[PDB]
PDB file of C-alpha atoms in Angstrom:
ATOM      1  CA  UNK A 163       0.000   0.000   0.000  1.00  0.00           C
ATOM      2  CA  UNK A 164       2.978   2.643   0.343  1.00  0.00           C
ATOM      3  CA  UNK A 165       4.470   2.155  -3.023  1.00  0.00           C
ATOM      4  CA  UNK A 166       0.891   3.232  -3.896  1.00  0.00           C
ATOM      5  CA  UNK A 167      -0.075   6.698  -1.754  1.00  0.00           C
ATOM      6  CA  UNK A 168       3.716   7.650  -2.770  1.00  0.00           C
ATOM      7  CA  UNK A 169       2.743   7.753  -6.470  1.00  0.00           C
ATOM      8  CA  UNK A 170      -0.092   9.247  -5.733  1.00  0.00           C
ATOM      9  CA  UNK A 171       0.903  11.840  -3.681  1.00  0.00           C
ATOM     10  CA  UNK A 172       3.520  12.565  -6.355  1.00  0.00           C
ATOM     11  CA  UNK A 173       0.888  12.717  -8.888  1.00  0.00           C
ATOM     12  CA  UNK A 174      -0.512  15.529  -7.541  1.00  0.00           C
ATOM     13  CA  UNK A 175       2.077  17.405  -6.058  1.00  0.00           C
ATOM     14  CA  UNK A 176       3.099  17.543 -10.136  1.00  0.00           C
ATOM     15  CA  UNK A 177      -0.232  18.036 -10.700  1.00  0.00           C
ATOM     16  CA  UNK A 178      -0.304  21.379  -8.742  1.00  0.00           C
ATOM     17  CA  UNK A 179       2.515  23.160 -10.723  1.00  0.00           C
ATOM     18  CA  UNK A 180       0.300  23.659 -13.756  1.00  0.00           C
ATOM     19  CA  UNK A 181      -9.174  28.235 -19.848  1.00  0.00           C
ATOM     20  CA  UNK A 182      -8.019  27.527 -15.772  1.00  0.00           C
ATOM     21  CA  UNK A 183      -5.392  25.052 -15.081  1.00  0.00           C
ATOM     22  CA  UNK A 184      -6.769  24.848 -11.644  1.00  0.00           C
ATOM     23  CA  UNK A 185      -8.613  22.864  -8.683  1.00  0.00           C
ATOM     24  CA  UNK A 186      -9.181  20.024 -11.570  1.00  0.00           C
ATOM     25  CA  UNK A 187      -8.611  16.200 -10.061  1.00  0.00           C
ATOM     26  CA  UNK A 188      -6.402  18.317  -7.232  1.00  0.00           C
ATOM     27  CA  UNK A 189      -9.123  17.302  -4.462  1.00  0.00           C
ATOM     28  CA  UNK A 190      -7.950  13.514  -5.347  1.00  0.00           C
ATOM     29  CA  UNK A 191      -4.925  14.299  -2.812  1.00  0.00           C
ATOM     30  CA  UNK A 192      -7.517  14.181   0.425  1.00  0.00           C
ATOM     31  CA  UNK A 193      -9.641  11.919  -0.370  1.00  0.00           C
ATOM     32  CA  UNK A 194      -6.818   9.044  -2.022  1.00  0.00           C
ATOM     33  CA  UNK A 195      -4.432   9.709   1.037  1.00  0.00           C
ATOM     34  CA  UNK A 196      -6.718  10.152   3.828  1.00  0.00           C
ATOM     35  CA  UNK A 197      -8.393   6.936   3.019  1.00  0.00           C
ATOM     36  CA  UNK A 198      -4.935   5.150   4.221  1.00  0.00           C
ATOM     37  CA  UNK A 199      -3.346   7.835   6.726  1.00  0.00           C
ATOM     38  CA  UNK A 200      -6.602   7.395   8.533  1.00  0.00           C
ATOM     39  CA  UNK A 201      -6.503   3.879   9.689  1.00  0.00           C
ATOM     40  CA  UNK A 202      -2.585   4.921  10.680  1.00  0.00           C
ATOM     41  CA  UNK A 203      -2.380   2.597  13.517  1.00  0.00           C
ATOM     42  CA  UNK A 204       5.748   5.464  17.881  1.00  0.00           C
ATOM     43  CA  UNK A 205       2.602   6.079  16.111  1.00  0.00           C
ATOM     44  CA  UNK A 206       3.731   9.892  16.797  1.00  0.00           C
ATOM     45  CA  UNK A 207       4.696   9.455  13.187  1.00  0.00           C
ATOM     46  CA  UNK A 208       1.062   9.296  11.746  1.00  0.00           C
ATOM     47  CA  UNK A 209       0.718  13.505  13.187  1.00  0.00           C
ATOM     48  CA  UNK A 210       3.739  14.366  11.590  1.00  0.00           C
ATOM     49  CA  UNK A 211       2.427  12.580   7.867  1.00  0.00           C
ATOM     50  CA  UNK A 212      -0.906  14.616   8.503  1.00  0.00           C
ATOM     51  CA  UNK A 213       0.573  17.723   9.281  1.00  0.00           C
ATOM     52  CA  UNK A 214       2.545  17.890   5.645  1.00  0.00           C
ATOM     53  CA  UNK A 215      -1.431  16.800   3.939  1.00  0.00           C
ATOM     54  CA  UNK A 216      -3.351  19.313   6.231  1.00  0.00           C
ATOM     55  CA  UNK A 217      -0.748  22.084   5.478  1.00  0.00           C
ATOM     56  CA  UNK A 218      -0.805  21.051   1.619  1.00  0.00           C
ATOM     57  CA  UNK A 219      -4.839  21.352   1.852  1.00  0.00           C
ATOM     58  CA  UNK A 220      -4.966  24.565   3.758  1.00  0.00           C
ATOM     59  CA  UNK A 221      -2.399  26.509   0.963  1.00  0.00           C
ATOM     60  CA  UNK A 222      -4.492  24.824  -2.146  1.00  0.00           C
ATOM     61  CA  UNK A 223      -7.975  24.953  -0.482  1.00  0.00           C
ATOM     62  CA  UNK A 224      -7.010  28.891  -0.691  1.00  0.00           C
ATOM     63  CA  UNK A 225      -9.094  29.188  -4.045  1.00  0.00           C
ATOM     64  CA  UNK A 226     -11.738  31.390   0.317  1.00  0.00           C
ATOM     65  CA  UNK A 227     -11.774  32.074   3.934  1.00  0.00           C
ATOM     66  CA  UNK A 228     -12.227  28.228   5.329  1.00  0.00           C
ATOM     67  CA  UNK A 229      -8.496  28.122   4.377  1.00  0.00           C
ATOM     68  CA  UNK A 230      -7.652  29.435   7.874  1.00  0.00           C
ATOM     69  CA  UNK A 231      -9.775  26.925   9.522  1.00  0.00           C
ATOM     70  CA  UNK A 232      -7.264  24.224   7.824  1.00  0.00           C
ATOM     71  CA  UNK A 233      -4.188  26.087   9.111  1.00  0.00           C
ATOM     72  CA  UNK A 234      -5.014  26.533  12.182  1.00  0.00           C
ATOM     73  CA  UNK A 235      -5.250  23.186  13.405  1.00  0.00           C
ATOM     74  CA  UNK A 236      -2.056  22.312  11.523  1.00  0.00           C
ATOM     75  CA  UNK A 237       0.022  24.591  13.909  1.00  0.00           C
ATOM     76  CA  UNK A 238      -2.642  23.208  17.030  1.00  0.00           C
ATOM     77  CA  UNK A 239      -1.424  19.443  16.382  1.00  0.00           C
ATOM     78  CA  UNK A 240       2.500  20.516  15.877  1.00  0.00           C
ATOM     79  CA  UNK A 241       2.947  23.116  18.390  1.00  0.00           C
ATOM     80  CA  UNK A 242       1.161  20.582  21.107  1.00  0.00           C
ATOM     81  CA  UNK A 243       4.241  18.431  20.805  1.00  0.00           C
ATOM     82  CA  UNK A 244      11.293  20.999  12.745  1.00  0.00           C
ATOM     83  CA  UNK A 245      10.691  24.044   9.986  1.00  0.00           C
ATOM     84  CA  UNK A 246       7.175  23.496   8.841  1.00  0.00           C
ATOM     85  CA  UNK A 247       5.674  25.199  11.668  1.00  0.00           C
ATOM     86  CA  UNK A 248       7.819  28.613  10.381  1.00  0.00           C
ATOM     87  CA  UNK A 249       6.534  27.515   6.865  1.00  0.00           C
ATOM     88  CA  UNK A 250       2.985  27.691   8.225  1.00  0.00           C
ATOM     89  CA  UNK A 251       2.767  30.699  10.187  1.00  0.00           C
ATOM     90  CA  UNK A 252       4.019  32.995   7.957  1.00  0.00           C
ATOM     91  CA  UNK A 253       0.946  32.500   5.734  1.00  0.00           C
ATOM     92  CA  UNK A 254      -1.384  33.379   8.484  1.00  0.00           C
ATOM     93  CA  UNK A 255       0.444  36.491   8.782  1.00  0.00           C
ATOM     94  CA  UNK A 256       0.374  37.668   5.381  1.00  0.00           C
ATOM     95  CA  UNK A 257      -3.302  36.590   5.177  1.00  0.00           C
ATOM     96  CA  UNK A 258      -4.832  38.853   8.592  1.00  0.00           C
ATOM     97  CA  UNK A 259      -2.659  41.418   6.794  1.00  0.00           C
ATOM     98  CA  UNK A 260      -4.067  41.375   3.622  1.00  0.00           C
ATOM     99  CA  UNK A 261      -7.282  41.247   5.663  1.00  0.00           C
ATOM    100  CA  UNK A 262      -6.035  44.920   6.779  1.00  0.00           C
ATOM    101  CA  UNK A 263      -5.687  43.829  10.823  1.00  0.00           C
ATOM    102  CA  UNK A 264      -1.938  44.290  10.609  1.00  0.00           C
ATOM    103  CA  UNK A 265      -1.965  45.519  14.233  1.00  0.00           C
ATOM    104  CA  UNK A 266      -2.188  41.490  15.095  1.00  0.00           C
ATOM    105  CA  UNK A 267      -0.508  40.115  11.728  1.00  0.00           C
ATOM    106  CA  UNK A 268       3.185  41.763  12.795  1.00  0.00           C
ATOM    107  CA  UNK A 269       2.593  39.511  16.419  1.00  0.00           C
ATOM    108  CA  UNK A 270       3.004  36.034  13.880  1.00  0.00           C
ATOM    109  CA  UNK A 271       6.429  37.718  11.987  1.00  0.00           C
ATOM    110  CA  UNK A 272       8.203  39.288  15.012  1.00  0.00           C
ATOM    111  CA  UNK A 273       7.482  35.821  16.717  1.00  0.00           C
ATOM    112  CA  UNK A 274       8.650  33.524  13.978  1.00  0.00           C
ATOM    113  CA  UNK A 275      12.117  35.492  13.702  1.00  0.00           C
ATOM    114  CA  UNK A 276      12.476  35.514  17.340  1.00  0.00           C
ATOM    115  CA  UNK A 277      12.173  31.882  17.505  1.00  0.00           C
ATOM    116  CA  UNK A 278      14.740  31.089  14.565  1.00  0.00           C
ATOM    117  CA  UNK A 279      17.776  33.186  16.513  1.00  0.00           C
ATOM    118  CA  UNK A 280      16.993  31.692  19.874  1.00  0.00           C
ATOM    119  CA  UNK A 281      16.458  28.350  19.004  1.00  0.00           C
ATOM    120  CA  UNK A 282      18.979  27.932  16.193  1.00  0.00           C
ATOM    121  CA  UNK A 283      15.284  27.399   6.057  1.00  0.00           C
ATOM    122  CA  UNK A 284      17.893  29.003   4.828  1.00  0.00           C
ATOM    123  CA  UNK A 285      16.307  29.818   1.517  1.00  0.00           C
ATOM    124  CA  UNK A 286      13.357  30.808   2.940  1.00  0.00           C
ATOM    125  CA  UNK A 287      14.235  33.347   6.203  1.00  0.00           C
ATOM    126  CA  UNK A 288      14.613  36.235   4.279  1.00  0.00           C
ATOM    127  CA  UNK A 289      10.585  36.191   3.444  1.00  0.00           C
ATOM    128  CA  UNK A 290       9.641  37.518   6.978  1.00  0.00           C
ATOM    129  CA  UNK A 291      12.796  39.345   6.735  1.00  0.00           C
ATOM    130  CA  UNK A 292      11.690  41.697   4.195  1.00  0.00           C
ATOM    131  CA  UNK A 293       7.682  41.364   4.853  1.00  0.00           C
ATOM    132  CA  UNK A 294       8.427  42.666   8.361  1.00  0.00           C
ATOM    133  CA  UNK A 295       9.731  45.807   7.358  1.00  0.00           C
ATOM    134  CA  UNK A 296       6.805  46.535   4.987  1.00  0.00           C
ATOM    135  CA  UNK A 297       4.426  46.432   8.226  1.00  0.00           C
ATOM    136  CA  UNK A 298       6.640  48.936  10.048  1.00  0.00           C
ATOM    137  CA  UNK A 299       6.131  51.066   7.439  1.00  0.00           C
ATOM    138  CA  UNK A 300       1.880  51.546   8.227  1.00  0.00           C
ATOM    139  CA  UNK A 301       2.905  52.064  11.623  1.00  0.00           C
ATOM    140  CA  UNK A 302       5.352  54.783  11.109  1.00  0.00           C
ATOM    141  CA  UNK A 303       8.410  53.734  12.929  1.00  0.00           C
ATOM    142  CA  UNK A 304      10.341  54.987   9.695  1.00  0.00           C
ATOM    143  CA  UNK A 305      13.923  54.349  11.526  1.00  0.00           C
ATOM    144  CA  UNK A 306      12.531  50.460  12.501  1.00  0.00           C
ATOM    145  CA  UNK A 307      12.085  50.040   8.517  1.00  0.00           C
ATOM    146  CA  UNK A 308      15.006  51.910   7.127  1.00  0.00           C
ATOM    147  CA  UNK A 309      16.988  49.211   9.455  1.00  0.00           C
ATOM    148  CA  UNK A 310      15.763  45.882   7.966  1.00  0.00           C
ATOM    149  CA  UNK A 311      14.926  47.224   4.132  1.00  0.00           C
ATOM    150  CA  UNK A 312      19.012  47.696   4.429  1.00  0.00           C
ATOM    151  CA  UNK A 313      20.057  44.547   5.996  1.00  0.00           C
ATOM    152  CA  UNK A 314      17.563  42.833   3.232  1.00  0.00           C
ATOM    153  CA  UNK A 315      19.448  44.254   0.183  1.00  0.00           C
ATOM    154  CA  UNK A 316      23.029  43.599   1.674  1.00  0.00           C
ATOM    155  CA  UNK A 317      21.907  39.988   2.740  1.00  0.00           C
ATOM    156  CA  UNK A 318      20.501  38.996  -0.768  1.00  0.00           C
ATOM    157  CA  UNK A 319      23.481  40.216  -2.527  1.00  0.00           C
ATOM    158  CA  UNK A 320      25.328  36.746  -1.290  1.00  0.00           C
ATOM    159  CA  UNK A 321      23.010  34.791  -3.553  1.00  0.00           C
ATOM    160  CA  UNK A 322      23.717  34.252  -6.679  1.00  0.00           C
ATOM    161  CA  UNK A 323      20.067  35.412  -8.331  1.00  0.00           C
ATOM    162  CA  UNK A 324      19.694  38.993  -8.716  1.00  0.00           C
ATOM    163  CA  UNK A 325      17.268  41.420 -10.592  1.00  0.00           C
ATOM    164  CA  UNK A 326      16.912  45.109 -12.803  1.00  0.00           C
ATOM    165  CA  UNK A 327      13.935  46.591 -11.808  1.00  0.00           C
ATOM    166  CA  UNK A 328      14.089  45.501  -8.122  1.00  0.00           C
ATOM    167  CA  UNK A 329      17.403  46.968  -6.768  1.00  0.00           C
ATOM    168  CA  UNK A 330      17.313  49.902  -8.876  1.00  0.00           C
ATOM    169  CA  UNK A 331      14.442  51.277  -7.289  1.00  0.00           C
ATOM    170  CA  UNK A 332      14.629  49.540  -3.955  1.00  0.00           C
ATOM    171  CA  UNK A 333      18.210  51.097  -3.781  1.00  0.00           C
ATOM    172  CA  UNK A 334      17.628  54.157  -5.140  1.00  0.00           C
ATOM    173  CA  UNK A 335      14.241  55.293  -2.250  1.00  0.00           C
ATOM    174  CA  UNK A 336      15.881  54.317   0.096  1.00  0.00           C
ATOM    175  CA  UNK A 337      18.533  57.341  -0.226  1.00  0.00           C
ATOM    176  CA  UNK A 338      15.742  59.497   0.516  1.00  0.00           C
ATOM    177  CA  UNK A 339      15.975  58.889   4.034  1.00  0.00           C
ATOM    178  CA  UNK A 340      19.981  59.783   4.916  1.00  0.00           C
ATOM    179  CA  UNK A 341      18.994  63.064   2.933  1.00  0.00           C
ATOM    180  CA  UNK A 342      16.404  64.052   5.421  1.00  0.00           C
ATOM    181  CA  UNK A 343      19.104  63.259   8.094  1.00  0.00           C
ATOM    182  CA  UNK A 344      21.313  65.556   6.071  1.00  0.00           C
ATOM    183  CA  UNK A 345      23.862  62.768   5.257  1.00  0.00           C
ATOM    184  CA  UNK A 346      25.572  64.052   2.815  1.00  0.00           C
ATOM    185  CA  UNK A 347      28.861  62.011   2.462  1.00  0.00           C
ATOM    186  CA  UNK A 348      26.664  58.485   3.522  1.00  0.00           C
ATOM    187  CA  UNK A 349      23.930  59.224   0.928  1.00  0.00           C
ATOM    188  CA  UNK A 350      26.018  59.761  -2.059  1.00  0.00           C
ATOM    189  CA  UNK A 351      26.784  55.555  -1.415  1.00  0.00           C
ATOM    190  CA  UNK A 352      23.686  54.908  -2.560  1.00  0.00           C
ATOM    191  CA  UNK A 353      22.839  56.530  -5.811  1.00  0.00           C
ATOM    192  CA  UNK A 354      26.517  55.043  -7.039  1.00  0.00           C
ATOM    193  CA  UNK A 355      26.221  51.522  -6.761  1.00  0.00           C
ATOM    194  CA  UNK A 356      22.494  51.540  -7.449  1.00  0.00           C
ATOM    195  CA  UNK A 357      23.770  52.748 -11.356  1.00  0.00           C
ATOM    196  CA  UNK A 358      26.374  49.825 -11.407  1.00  0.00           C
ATOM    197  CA  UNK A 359      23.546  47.049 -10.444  1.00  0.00           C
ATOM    198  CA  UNK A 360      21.259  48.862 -13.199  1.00  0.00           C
ATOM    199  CA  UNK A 361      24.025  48.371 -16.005  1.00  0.00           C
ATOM    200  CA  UNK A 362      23.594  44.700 -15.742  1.00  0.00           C
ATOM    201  CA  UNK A 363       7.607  50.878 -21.179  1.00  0.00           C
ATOM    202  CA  UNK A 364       8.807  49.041 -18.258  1.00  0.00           C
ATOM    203  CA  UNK A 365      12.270  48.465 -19.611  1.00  0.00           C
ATOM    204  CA  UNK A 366      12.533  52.261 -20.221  1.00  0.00           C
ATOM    205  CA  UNK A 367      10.442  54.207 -17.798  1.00  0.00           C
ATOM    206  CA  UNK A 368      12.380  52.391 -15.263  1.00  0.00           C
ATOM    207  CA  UNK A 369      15.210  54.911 -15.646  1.00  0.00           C
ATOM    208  CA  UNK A 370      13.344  57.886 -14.753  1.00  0.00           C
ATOM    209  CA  UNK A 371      13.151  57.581 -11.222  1.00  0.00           C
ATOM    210  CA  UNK A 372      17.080  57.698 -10.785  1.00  0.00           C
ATOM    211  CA  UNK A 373      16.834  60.847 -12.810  1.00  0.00           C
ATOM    212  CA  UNK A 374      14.654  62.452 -10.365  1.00  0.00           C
ATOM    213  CA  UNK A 375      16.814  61.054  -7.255  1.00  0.00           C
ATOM    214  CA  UNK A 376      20.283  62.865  -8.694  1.00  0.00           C
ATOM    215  CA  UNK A 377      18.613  66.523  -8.670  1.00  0.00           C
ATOM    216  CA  UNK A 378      17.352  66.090  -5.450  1.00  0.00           C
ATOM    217  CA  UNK A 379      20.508  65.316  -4.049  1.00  0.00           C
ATOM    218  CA  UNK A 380      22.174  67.906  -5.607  1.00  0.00           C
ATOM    219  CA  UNK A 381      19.869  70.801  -5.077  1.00  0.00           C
ATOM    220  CA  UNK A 382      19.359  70.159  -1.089  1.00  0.00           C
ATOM    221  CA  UNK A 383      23.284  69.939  -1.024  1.00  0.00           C
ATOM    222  CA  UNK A 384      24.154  73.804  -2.783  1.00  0.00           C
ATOM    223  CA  UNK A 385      20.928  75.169  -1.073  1.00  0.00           C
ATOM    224  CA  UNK A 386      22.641  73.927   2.578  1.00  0.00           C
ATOM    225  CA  UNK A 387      24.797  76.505   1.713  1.00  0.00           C
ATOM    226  CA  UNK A 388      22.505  79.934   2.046  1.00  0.00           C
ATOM    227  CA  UNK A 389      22.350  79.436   5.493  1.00  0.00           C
ATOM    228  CA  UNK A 390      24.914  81.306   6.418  1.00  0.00           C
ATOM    229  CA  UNK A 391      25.484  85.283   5.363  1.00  0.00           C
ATOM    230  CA  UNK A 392      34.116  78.990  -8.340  1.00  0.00           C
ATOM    231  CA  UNK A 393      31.981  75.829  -7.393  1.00  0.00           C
ATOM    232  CA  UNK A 394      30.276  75.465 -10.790  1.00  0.00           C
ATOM    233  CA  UNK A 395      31.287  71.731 -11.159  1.00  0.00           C
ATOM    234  CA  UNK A 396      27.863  70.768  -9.374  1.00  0.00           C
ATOM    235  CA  UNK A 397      25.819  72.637 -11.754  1.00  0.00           C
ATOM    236  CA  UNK A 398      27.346  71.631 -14.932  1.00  0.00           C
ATOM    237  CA  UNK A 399      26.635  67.803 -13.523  1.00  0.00           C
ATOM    238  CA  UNK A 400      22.986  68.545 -12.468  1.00  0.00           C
ATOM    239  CA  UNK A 401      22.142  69.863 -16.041  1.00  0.00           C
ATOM    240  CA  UNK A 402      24.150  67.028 -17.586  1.00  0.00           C
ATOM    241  CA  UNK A 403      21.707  64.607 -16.200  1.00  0.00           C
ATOM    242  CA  UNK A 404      18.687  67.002 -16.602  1.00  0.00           C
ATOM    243  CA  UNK A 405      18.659  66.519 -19.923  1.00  0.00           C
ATOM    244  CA  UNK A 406      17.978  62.764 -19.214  1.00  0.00           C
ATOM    245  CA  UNK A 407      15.698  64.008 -16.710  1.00  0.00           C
ATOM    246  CA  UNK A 408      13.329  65.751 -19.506  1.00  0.00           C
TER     247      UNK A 408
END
């Protein structure tokens, strides 16, 4: 009988990478393998086999609220007794948020990074990583964010897959925020390696955002200088790139 449910349950775990394409002969997974893990009879064993089916039915059986009811009790049987809980829980946090309650959806992230320092995957921390600072970001702790949305770019520079459109603009906001703090030999990083990263419609309204980040930087910086009360280089540069600008 286990050659059999193993076919089976590779059957449709193949299945489920495909006028649809969806839900189509997918519900065969509960009813084929719950008709043998039921009769299971340590037997400990038989709630680790459900909890993999259970959390398989609760993602799919998402196309629809009853979802949650699945998850739920998939994180009730594990937690009563080693990474599929962290695979779990970060769904029901990006589900409450989506359902705009974010002021109890950051209480599942905060708790699931928590528990990876303390009690220690890989590929898959950074996901709470970068959701968490998004969340900071609707409660206004702008210093909280500007932290992690750092330590996020820096950290997925080690892996070898990397992206146009994403760093470019990622890296290029986020200079925004050591120009309000009047950074002016920090900020300048920024805007310089974002261009490198770059160099390697969407494909060309995508430049016109760094446009608009180089004047800003170098108006507040000559403007710094009224304050108080031969340096033409920075205007000849902010015109050479204003003509990309317009």
């Amino acid at each position: 009988p286990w050659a059999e449910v193993c076919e089976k349950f590779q059957a449709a775990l193949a299945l489920s990478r495909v006028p649809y394409k969806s839900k189509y002969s997918a519900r065969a997974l509960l009813e084929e393998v719950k008709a043998l893990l039921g009769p299971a009879p340590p037997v400990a064993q038989r709630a680790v086999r459900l909890a993999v089916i259970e959390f398989h039915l609760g993602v799919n059986h998402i196309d629809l609220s009853a979802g949650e009811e699945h998850l739920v009790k998939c994180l009730r049987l594990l937690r009563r007794y080693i990474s599929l809980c962290i695979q779990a829980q970060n769904n029901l946090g990006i589900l409450w948020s989506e359902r705009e309650e974010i002021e109890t959806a950051q209480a599942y992230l905060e708790s699931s990074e928590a528990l990876y320092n303390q009690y220690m995957f890989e590929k898959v921390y950074t996901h709470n990583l970068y959701y968490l600072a998004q969340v900071y970001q609707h409660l206004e702790m702008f210093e909280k964010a500007a932290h992690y949305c750092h330590s996020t770019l820096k950290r997925q520079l080690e892996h070898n897959a990397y992206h146009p459109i994403e760093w470019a603009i990622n890296a290029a906001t986020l200079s925004q925020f050591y120009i309000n703090k009047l950074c002016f030999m920090e900020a300048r990083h920024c805007l310089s390696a974002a261009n490198v990263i770059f160099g390697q419609e969407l494909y060309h309204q995508r430049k016109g955002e760094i446009a608009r980040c180089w004047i800003k930087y170098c108006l507040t910086l000559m403007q710094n200088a009224q304050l108080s009360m031969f340096e033409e280089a920075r205007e000849l540069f902010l015109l050479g790139q204003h003509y990309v600008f317009e």
